[PDB]
Design a protein around this motif. Structure first.
Motif, short mmCIF file in Angstrom:
data_model
loop_
_atom_site.label_atom_id
_atom_site.label_comp_id
_atom_site.label_asym_id
_atom_site.label_seq_id
_atom_site.Cartn_x
_atom_site.Cartn_y
_atom_site.Cartn_z
N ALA A 1 0.85 -1.18 0.00
CA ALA A 1 0.00 0.00 0.00
C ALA A 1 0.90 1.24 0.00
N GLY B 1 -4.51 3.90 -2.01
CA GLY B 1 -5.52 3.40 -1.12
C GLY B 1 -5.56 4.20 0.16
N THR B 2 -5.84 3.58 1.28
CA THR B 2 -5.84 4.27 2.57
C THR B 2 -4.47 4.87 2.88
N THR B 3 -3.44 4.04 2.77
CA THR B 3 -2.07 4.46 3.06
C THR B 3 -1.62 5.57 2.11
N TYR C 1 -12.27 -5.08 -0.26
CA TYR C 1 -11.48 -4.53 0.83
C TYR C 1 -12.38 -4.24 2.02
N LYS D 1 -9.32 -8.24 0.76
CA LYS D 1 -8.31 -7.78 1.70
C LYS D 1 -8.99 -7.57 3.05
#
Ligand SMILES: NCCCC[C@@](N)(CC[C@](N)(CCCCN)C(=O)O)C(=O)O
Ligand SMILES: NCCCC[C@@](N)(CC[C@](N)(CCCCN)C(=O)O)C(=O)O
Ligand SMILES: [Cl-]
Lengths: 297, 296, 296, 295
Positions: free
Chosen positions: D9, D43-45, D134, D163
């Motif tokens: 990520a 993504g989030t990261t 996810y 995920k």
């Protein structure tokens, strides 16, 4: 003192017609709110499906509410929140420039910022507009909680941040907030416990139920503000069932269903990922709304 | 329905060299009586029921009854257990030794079903003719008495008159009194004593009142008299110490405070309970400095 | 350190006419031994420790001890309590009566601090000579033995050798063995037996093994010989029965399954425990139709 | 058609408020050169919430180009809480050469399981590349149930797995007990090995930003059924895996990347910001126990 927006408020639904915002229905529903004693309306927050509206559509609905409440005492507390600070500031500025009386700004959802980041997120927003800012705490949807410390700090460092809409179902936090900072405007964001929050010094509600029963929420709120707690509680007790059932599926799925069943909107449409309730909950929603008097147009 | 309401104190249980200090205990009880408390609750959670033997538990109840005899103060005896035959036993003793009613905690650790809860309390209620108050504290028991189970028990058993809620869930309080407004809802959570009272709650079972019986009593009676302005003001005043008294598991902080105030002469628990962490020791000592604590 | 590991069974406690069916008990234990179980746990949560008298609890310890004598099967006595003097008393009794070790649940309901948990367990460990296994189950007890506390106790008390984890926290399981790889992590949650073993856990204390001792025993031993593909296979196969055995609070379903299998005489509990609803009775009966259940 | 193994990520480096495109590229080649099987852009990261849709799209393109000519795949972040947005991102990713898409469950608006199904179905029907579900309840406010996951996996050819970032190994057992054909991917670094040992076929890692070589070694050891070796690395990584979530990801990882000299400035977009001083010190201390590869 701070400039404030309190009293009975409605988190307006956003009626869709063929996947598009039914603008004249939107206005009509706002007029119905105004005529039933509601002190302010909240265009496009969570109940208004802010997530699936475009930024331009979001702005249009804010305009409509402003123009409809123009020439009335009814204030427009615009939904201007985001999980990106540059987006929220953009919405705050639009709401400011287009005549909104204030903004509701939900705590950043999903990215789970720290209390420090929450402070700066809101400080930024507040130092960009002239208007009153109401904080919005709803941990069950955002994944983060604005602590009491941060709320009070923001209130004491930013002139135009005048309170918090609490939807955390935590009456202890409400005591905490008003005992340490009795100047802030505590607003109920959880209908079932409207009266308990008001009776502890809360100064208004932002209601989902008032979409369907604006006269009853307005009466509840105003009774409480004039310290007629027995009658405010009476109404809050009567409303408990529908207050719950409006959450049997995720808001605004049940309230929009109820509005449709009541003949207050033409079609039952959601934007994905939101959809119609199960036929079971559909019947459950039909069940509870039959036990209440529902104002027409 | 016969009932027990108003301002009530969950009494701490003082120890001396590991034994129940029966002299300090009775002296602590009359300090409550003098300060206008309506009822005392001997050996509940705050009184360390878990680590008392059944005979010590029984001794505390009898001291409470006898000490209150001659006054208006009632005894709502802690009689709960996670084994129904133990609870019934405690209730029978409580009745036969002059207690005005029983407080019966929901079974902990073994996690009974709602059907098991109903039968637990139906058994208890049917074994005595005195009032019974349900006690819901999910954070300690790992179990919840549902609103339906509570309402059914109230309706089906003549001597079950309500519930002590210690759950931090004002929504359930609304739920309870909206569908069954005839029950007696008691606050088992000091910080939110007033919000519960304002929604039709009829009393509190307090930890704070061990230390500040006059203030807790004034709060309760203001609210019962529909003087909500005064009840709220006091609840706001009490908030800081209401929280700090739960900075560690009750009743570790309240015993600590009673020690600092000089109301008990040693700070002694029975394991696995022990002294607070020193950081929380400091918080308690410095918070209680902002309140006026009545002596004997 | 002396240890007790491998496939272990949390023995149910069969009742007949309200009393402990001592004959059924020994029979169930013999059945466990004959299917490769390494050790038995008398009177834990699964054995309804809450509703047994101290006298009865002791009776069940002796029976398991006697039945297992002659064999290579060890007895891990359930000796936990929320009162330290009660836990120490049970610990000593167990030593004296031949128990190979003791299982000691974290104090329930009264919610001790980590410091209190330390002194609680330290008292138990030093009062006996035999190995002590910690038991973490926050869902029932209301408190959590932190990693640091578990490890400190492991290092400071020669006979505390590991912990039975029933918290569904595989993160914590990694934490423990990454920092203290010498300790014996025991699974106290059937559904995730395999992940616990594959991370270096050395045994299970199972509810399911009451009904399917051969499968649980095989799972653990495949795991211990680093045959994970086989251990995972059995664990995957067992997932349906593992979950359904908690559709109501344990041991309500496992006792129901044992009754349905014809392994015990009657479906009997002590209040506040009771029979499952008819619907859950059906679910349990439905699911165990998929598994080969061993006879007496 | 699937995308599995060690995945990263990617963090998104900022420079004067803007996305440092070239630092981003350099960071990805560093991942490639350390045995990473795929990179997950934005993504989030990667601070997807605060990137604009234009910057979001730019980042995907950079990842695709940087990886062209290599075995390394690009699992593009394409999730959103509005289906018309997610479909948009899905189609962009496909038409710009991504090998698949990572798609987070709708956050904040809390769709029903029926809504989640229709959401992902609409996404899966809009492109022909693999789609990885996810699930991160702690951030989204909703859980994709095991049933909905399995339903979607079966009814949709391209939905190939999920995920999981819910710290619930019971669920992982459940998922692979009833549907072993799906690719379970670890989204929680601390428990990479336990998820792999139960049949998980790779990780999408935050830690691999800093220690790509160790994460891919853990993953590949595990995929080769060398569980003894995978566990030892997972044990060694536990310190850094936990400290990287002492504040909300990706605040600690970006702090760590900065301290290690892998990015120019410790710069976030609000509402994200620098860690506290104490957390800054805790982070600095733990990464001193690990060898951090360079460029
Ligand atoms: N009413 C205005 C539109 C709302 C947009 C959005 N769907 C998503 C917002 C966003 N910050 C956009 C990021 C896009 C690039 N990754 C988000 O998805 O987090 C939301 O806030 O719910
Ligand atoms: N109030 C006086 C009695 C206190 C005893 C006990 N510590 C233990 C209760 C018990 N039911 C005892 C059973 C002993 C046999 N295992 C329990 O431990 O659950 C408790 O009730 O918390
Ligand atoms: Cl991510």
């Amino acid at each position: 003192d701070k400039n404030i927006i309190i009293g009975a408020m409605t988190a307006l639904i956003t009626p869709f017609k063929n996947g598009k915002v039914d603008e004249q229905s939107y206005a009509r529903l706002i007029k119905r709110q105004i005529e039933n004693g509601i002190d302010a309306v909240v265009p496009v927050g969570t109940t208004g499906e802010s997530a699936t509206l475009t930024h331009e559509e979001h702005r249009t609905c804010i305009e409509i509410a402003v123009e409809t409440c123009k020439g009335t005492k009814v204030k427009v507390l615009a939904g201007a929140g985001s999980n990106a600070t540059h987006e929220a500031v953009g919405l705050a500025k639009f709401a400011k420039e287009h005549g909104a009386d204030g903004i509701l700004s939900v705590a950043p959802f999903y990215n789970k910022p720290t209390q420090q980041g929450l402070y700066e997120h809101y400080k930024a927003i507040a130092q960009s507009v002239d208007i009153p800012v109401l904080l919005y705490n709803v941990p069950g949807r955002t994944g983060c909680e604005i602590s009491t410390d941060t709320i009070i700090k923001l209130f004491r460092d930013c002139e135009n941040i005048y309170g918090v809409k609490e939807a955390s179902g935590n009456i202890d936090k409400c005591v905490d907030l008003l005992a340490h900072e009795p100047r802030m405007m505590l607003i109920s964001g959880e209908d079932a416990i409207n009266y308990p929050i008001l009776s502890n010094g809360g100064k208004g509600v932002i209601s989902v139920t008032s979409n369907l029963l604006p006269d009853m929420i307005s009466a509840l709120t105003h009774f409480a503000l004039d310290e007629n707690y027995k009658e405010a509680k009476k109404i809050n007790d009567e409303l408990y069932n529908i207050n719950k059932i409006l959450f049997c599926e995720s808001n605004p799925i049940p309230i929009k269903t109820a509005m449709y069943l009541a003949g207050l909107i033409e079609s039952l449409e959601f934007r994905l990922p939101l959809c119609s309730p199960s036929k079971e909950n559909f019947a459950k929603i039909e069940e509870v709304m039959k036990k209440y008097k529902i104002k027409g147009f």
